[PDB]
Amino acid sequence: SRACFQVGSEEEKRQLRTESDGLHSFFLEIKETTESLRGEFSAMKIKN
Amino acid sequence: STSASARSMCRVLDDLLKKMPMLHTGGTQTLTEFELKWQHWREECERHLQNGTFSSNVHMEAVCRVLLGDEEVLLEKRDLMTTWYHFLVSRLLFKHPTVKPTELHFYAQ
Amino acid sequence: NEVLLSPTQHHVALVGSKGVMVLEIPKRWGKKSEFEGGEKTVNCRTIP
Amino acid sequence: NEVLLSPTQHHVALVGSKGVMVLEIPKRWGKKSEFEGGEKTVNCRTIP
Amino acid sequence: ATAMTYAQLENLINKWSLELEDQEKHFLQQATQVNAWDRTLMQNGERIT
Amino acid sequence: PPSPPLLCSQSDKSSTEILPHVLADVKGPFEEHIRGILRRNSANPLLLNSSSKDSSPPPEECLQLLSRATQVFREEYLLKQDLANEEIQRRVKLLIA
């Protein structure tokens, strides 16, 4: 009886997975936005 | 393709559908082998449901739960389950690999 | 001595040391799952 | 039983009369000799 | 003191074997759940890193 | 039977879920360790009342049979269940951390 059947519930794992997926998508879109921004900065420096 | 984290689930569903036997396993082969393959597919589905990968996605979770034998979703959405004739044929397709006449009448009533 | 059943499930052979006794099994029909339309006492033919 | 370190300085292998357990430990440089100059959220799980 | 026979001994042995089998099955299920949770935690830690 | 890299589709896994694998590539639960612990050469027979005895059972014989059964049980299942419980408890505090 001391040994638990499982540590935590499936709701916590689902929340962790959803948070990880959201963070991955946000970081990917932020990386794409920063790449576009650095390209625009290079174009602006060329124009200057 | 529409989602961004369902490719593994779709591949698992395709593998389960491939493991699901068809007509080449029974009928003209061996009824015992067909029943064994059906039981193996059912226990594999139960194991895949109890492993924990079906926690997310309430749609696929309900689909897998209906594929096992639980008809809670059917009892909740009986307005879309047509009639009791289709309910009975769905029960037969689910948890009835071999049907007996007396057992058929019992399940019908 | 011993009993055996045919793989087709229609004959039952009592096998001993002084011949075999082959008994016929009637097929079930009707509403009841019993033999001969739900009959309790059924006279089954036997041959030596 | 014993411990070993990878020649690339990245993996620690606990070897015993049953198998090995590999653990990924990043390099220690910068700040107070921490991982990558101050990081405690790296992968610290053993693999059989 | 009471009815000394083999029936009570057989029943006790059968119940002990059944309890041991149930305990072994529960231990196997707990080990499977623990391994699944360990896999999920390792995946989550890799994703977090 | 004993479980080497065998075809098991009940509790062992192949990668991420339960799959009928023929080669041991990914450990399932702890079936291999459980078998290595249970590696024995005895058995635990379940007795059934179905014989025609001659007289009343002797108390000495009954006590000897009970002691033998209890010793066999404590030597073939108790230590194995304790080791399994310890192995299960090994991954609890680490899981919480």
Please report, for residues C19, E11, F57, the alpha-carbon distance to residue F46 in angstroms, rounded to integers and kept in the order given.
39, 9, 18
Distance CA B68, CA B54 (A): 13
What's the rounded Cα separation, in Å, for the pair F65 and A24? 65
- Sequence-distant (6+) residues with CB within 8 A of F67 are none
B→E contacts (Cβ < 8 Å), by residue, are 51-52
The whole-angstrom separation of Cα F28 and Cα E13 is 32
Q: How many residues does chain B have?
A: 109
Query: At A39, is the secondary structure helix, strand, or coil?
Result: helix
Residues with Cβ < 8 Å from D39, sequence gap 6 or more? D26
Residues of A in contact with E47 (CB under 8 A): 20, 24
Answer for the pair C39, C46: CB distance below 8 angstroms, yes or no: no
Which DSSP helix (H) or strand (E) runs through B56?
A: none
What's the resolution in A? Answer: 8.7
Do the Cβ atoms of E24 and F49 come within 8 Å? Answer: no
Q: Are F16 and F33 in contact (CB under 8 A)?
A: no
**DSSP run (H or E) holding C14:** strand C11-15
CA distances from A41 to A28, B70, D42 (A): 20, 59, 33
Residue B10, amino acid: C
Closest CA to C36 of B99, C45, C7, B107: C45
The Cα–Cα gap between A6 and E31 comes to 9
Inform me whether the C-beta atom of residue E37 falls under 8 Å from chain D C-beta atoms. no
| Structure-solving method | cryo-EM
Q: Quote the Cα angle for E12-E17-E20, to 5°.
A: 125
CA angle A6, B42, B86 (to 5 degrees): 120
The amino acid that residue D34 corresponds to is E
Distance to chain A for E8, nearest Cα, Å: 28
CB contact under 8 A, E49 and D42: yes
- Pick the closest to residue D14 from D3, D26, D24 (CA basis): D3
Beta carbons within 8 Å of B68's beta carbon, 6+ residues apart: B42, B45, B46, B49
**b/e code D18-33 from CB counts within 10 Å (16+ = b):** eeeeeebeeeeeeeee
Q: Number of residue pairs across B and E with CB atoms under 8 Å?
A: 3
Measure in Å the smallest separation between the Cα of F53 and chain E Cα atoms: 10
**What are residue C4's DSSP bridge partners?**
C13
